[PDB]
Amino acid sequence: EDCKLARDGPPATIVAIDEESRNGTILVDNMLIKGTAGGPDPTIELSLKDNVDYWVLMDPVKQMLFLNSTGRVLDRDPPMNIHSIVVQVQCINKKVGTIIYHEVRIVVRDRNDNSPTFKHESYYATVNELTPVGTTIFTGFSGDNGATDIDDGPNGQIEYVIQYNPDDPTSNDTFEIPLMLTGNIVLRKRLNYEDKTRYFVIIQANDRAQNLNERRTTTTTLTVDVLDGDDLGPMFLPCTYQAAIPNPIIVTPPIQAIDQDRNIQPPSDRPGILYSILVGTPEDYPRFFHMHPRTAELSLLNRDFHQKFDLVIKAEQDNGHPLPAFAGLHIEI
Amino acid sequence: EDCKLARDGPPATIVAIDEESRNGTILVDNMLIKGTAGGPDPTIELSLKDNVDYWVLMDPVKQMLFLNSTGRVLDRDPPMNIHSIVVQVQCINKKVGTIIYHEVRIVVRDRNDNSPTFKHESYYATVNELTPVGTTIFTGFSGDNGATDIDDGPNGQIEYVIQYNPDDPTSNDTFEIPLMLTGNIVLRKRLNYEDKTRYFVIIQANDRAQNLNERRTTTTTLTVDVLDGDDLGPMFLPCTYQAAIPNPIIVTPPIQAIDQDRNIQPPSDRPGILYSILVGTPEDYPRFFHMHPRTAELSLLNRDFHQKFDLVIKAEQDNGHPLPAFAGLHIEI
Numbered sequence A, B: 001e002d003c004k005l006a007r008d009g010p011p012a013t014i015v016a017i018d019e020e021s022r023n024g025t026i027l028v029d030n031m032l033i034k035g036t037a038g039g040p041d042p043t044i045e046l047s048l049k050d051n052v053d054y055w056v057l058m059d060p061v062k063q064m065l066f067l068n069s070t071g072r073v074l075d076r077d078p079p080m081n082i083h084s085i086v087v088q089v090q091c092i093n094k095k096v097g098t099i100i101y102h103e104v105r106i107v108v109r110d111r112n113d114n115s116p117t118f119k120h121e122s123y124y125a126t127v128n129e130l131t132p133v134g135t136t137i138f139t140g141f142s143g144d145n146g147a148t149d150i151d152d153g154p155n156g157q158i159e160y161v162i163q164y165n166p167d168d169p170t171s172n173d174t175f176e177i178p179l180m181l182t183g184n185i186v187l188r189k190r191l192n193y194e195d196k197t198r199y200f201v202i203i204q205a206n207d208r209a210q211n212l213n214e215r216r217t218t219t220t221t222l223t224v225d226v227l228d229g230d231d232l233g234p235m236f237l238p239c240t241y242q243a244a245i246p247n248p249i250i251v252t253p254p255i256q257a258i259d260q261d262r263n264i265q266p267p268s269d270r271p272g273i274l275y276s277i278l279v280g281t282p283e284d285y286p287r288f289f290h291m292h293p294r295t296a297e298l299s300l301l302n303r304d305f306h307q308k309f310d311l312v313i314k315a316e317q318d319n320g321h322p323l324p325a326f327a328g329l330h331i332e333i
């Protein structure tokens, strides 16, 4: 009869304990095994079996199991991955000679003992100033190239969240993370490179433990650089061109324009200027004037018929963004 | 012989004088008419003819003509439009009886005695914050609904030019007039309504007289109001929804979103919010949950099969600008 379970219920003893419990922690009150080990005339014999690196010790009389973790650590996490522990409690019957193995399964439960950690020390993005609000401009926290958390379940999920930068109070306002779980940054305000070209964006990763009081965090700075877009065309220099006649025709000062965006990258994209005449009076002006369209050099083609010509000059960009600039030119005879 | 011209040259005397000359101004030195009026025995008789409101007086002996403008003004401009003056100098010959008319044409020359003037005391425009740089946003100086100048030729043309506002040093920088002659204003920087909603733009009109020292000007304030565009979608309130089960299902707090742009005009354009569930676990969640797409009301459709459902909720705009917002919802059993 003895050496079989005294309790009702199923024939494994299943129990659970928080990971990171310390030496001596009870694991089973009372196995509750019909019979009595020890005393003067013991009726059963108990011992442990498949107890590797003796994580369990036993008190055969009270039939009670303790953890045995001195010096070592009961870590459910990488790199230990101790999720359960199974051991067997071989009982021998001293009369009848019966030998049973009582299984004891011990379920270690993750705790939120680990914080998020970012793979990189800092992160970094760029964004052309023409980007519309709504645009995702950064996705570097995917690929597990962002924060990680060694813990399991929600103890191991990240929500990313922008934080106020006291050394850049504008950063806060100019970007967001609509989806906390992705941690994609999204442009929230329009930009003028001309005004401000860099943003320091603190992002705070945080795990998602149920008890909000058990929730670890990290932060990182994301440096974001604004890129000069082509939103402006040329401008003449020096910042009404004058000519005279009774060749090529000398023009004071000399017609020169330049793109107004002053830091296009790469230079490969820096466009060129095309000069034309646009309108003029007397209206027969085309009879007498061409202008070379990449250098603005006066082709000439009658004092008492025409005292003077007054023209107006276009310069525009040569990349299907004319964004054109204008300047007069007077010409006496 | 006498009473014919003594000078060579053509048979009209043409001469010119600046408008706004004052009484006594000589108009002809010497008509230079063969013969001699007055003295003891005059040989010719001179008088004026077609001299209306006697703008000319004559000295028959010296054969000299003076202006006669006392009390009145020699105004080439509207509303006087005195461009020339023609009079005839009837000479009679006292022997032979010859009668000639010497024409005298007097060409009044515009002066820059009049400044530009704006039709309105102030001007005004609006502009949605989504307008791209390059966009013409104002054209109210066409139609001669801008500045005018009563003077003629260049004395009468306008160039419009933005000026620095010390009470709005940003206005300067945010708009330009690429074409001075039109005076169209063009957006020069991107805008965030959220930051600044009004601009006071001083524009200076100026005439285009040749002598730059003779050039009159005017100024005007243009008030420009920024309009809130739809660049942002909704946001949930109060600024992770919780539910429980062993209908409709009660949600704490109750799911409510709202558009983030907070001054769309007209209200006609204020959009509506559409709620859906997006993703969920356990993944069989669709078996049990619909949500009404305009009110977010939980349709329900097993304690030991499913302990809990954890869903995530979209709210998006209903005008083909989803610009969607996200929020979790947990549900215990």
Ligand SMILES: [Ca+2]
Pocket: A019, A020, A074, A075, A076, A077, A113
């Ligand atoms: Ca651990």
Ligand SMILES: [Ca+2]
Pocket: A019, A076, A077, A110, A111, A112, A113, A114, A150, A151, A152
């Ligand atoms: Ca852990």
Ligand SMILES: [Ca+2]
Pocket: A112, A113, A114, A115, A116, A149, A150, A151, A155, A156, A207, A216
């Ligand atoms: Ca954790």
Ligand SMILES: [Ca+2]
Pocket: A129, A193, A228, A229, A230, A231, A232, A261, A262
């Ligand atoms: Ca630019």
Ligand SMILES: [Ca+2]
Pocket: A229, A230, A231, A232, A233, A259, A260, A261, A317
């Ligand atoms: Ca450009």
Ligand SMILES: [Ca+2]
Pocket: B019, B020, B074, B075, B076, B077, B113
């Ligand atoms: Ca006048």
Ligand SMILES: [Ca+2]
Pocket: B019, B076, B077, B110, B111, B112, B113, B114, B150, B151, B152
């Ligand atoms: Ca005048």
Ligand SMILES: [Ca+2]
Pocket: B112, B113, B114, B115, B116, B149, B150, B151, B155, B156, B207, B216
């Ligand atoms: Ca004028």
Ligand SMILES: [Ca+2]
Pocket: B129, B193, B228, B229, B230, B231, B232, B261, B262
């Ligand atoms: Ca807006």
Ligand SMILES: [Ca+2]
Pocket: B229, B230, B231, B232, B233, B259, B260, B261, B317
């Ligand atoms: Ca909106």
